[PDB]
Scaffold this active site. Structure first.
Site, PDB file in Angstrom:
ATOM      1  N   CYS A 161       1.416 -11.006  -5.122  1.00 14.31           N
ATOM      2  CA  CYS A 161       0.318 -10.060  -5.031  1.00 14.31           C
ATOM      3  C   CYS A 161      -0.982 -10.839  -5.099  1.00 14.31           C
ATOM      4  O   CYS A 161      -1.044 -11.920  -5.686  1.00 14.31           O
ATOM      5  CB  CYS A 161       0.357  -9.010  -6.151  1.00 14.31           C
ATOM      6  N   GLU A 217       3.831 -11.835   0.526  1.00 12.73           N
ATOM      7  CA  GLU A 217       4.811 -10.766   0.420  1.00 12.73           C
ATOM      8  C   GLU A 217       4.249  -9.481   1.013  1.00 12.73           C
ATOM      9  O   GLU A 217       3.098  -9.117   0.756  1.00 12.73           O
ATOM     10  CB  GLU A 217       5.201 -10.546  -1.037  1.00 12.73           C
TER      11      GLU A 217
END
Ligand code: NBJ
Ligand code: ZN
Length: 270
Positions: A140, A174
């Site tokens: 993140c 991601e």
């Protein structure tokens, strides 16, 4: 009923998403966060008491990058569990897709700060799994709202790829990315690929090894620039030196970056 507003440093910031702070913490008008150790408090009074006592003036962990007043600290989730949990709860206020808040031991956190005489002020961070089975160099990435669109996200993206280069690896964020995340990666990839194409020439495989951008992200970026042709089942770069310059002179690449000075980065693969 949910936390809707935080006070951190001299900023008050409205929440964008639910974050699972304990329920009692959500009942107040505000959550008060120490900007240095990220302790969250229920009352302005305990916040002010904490401010006069807290001795931290920068993130824990090791300062692996310092140039002028820009600093990055590497924080191992296993070594600094409470801090990293505090960080993930704060980040979830502004990230829709993040799902891990408490099990932080498999992650390392790279904290971006802006230093002045009072100390090192948090701007954003990205997390990274210590062992990624799917080759993600970011899990993140979050820039606090009042710092967004000011060059700090671009710094952190570049920083994540400078780590990948030191690892001799390609990496990819991601998925899924936020709206702004999509735009920021696309624009970072375009800049980096166009500068490389101007400076040299190169296959898609060559560019991947020089940048640590995955071949898929390069191909999709070159497709949006219309600089790739398809020949008997392979993507091939197709670009004239002039078209590259017309792209680079565009107004979006006009703002001066915070660069990552490779010389100021102190880090070896773990
Ligand atoms: O702040 C943001 N992005 N804005 S940017 O640093 O100005 C930028 C400029 C050019 C290219 C790339 C950039 F990221 C931002 C905020 C939250 C999450 C992410 I992911 C990015
Ligand atoms: Zn504190």
């Amino acid at each position: 009923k949910y936390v809707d507003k935080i006070h951190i440093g001299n900023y008050e910031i409205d929440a964008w998403y639910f974050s699972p702070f304990p329920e009692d913490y959500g009942k107040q008008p505000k959550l008060w966060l120490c900007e240095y150790c990220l302790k969250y408090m229920k009352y302005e009074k305990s916040y002010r008491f904490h401010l006069g006592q807290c001795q931290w003036r920068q993130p824990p962990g090791k300062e692996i990058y310092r140039k002028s007043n820009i600093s990055v600290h590497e924080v191992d989730g296993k070594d600094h569990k409470i801090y990293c949990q505090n960080l993930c709860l704060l980040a979830k206020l502004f990230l829709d897709h993040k799902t891990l808040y408490f099990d932080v031991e498999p992650f390392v956190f790279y904290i971006l700060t802006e230093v002045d005489r009072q100390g090192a002020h948090i701007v954003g961070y990205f997390s990274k799994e210590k062992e990624s089975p799917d080759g993600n160099n970011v899990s993140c990435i979050m820039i606090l709202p009042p710092y967004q669109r000011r060059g700090y996200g671009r710094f952190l993206i570049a920083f994540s790829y400078e780590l990948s280069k030191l690892e001799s690896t390609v990496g990819s964020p991601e998925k899924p990315l936020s709206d702004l995340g999509k735009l920021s990666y696309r624009s970072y990839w375009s800049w980096v690929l166009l500068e490389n194409l101007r400076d040299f020439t190169l296959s898609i495989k060559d560019l991947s090894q020089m940048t640590s951008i995955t071949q898929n992200d390069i191909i999709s970026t070159l497709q949006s620039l219309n600089m790739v042709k398809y020949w008997k089942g392979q993507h091939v770069i197709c670009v004239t030196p002039k078209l590259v310059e017309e792209h680079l002179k565009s107004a979006q690449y006009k703002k001066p970056p915070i660069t990552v000075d490779s010389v100021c980065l102190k880090w070896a693969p773990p």
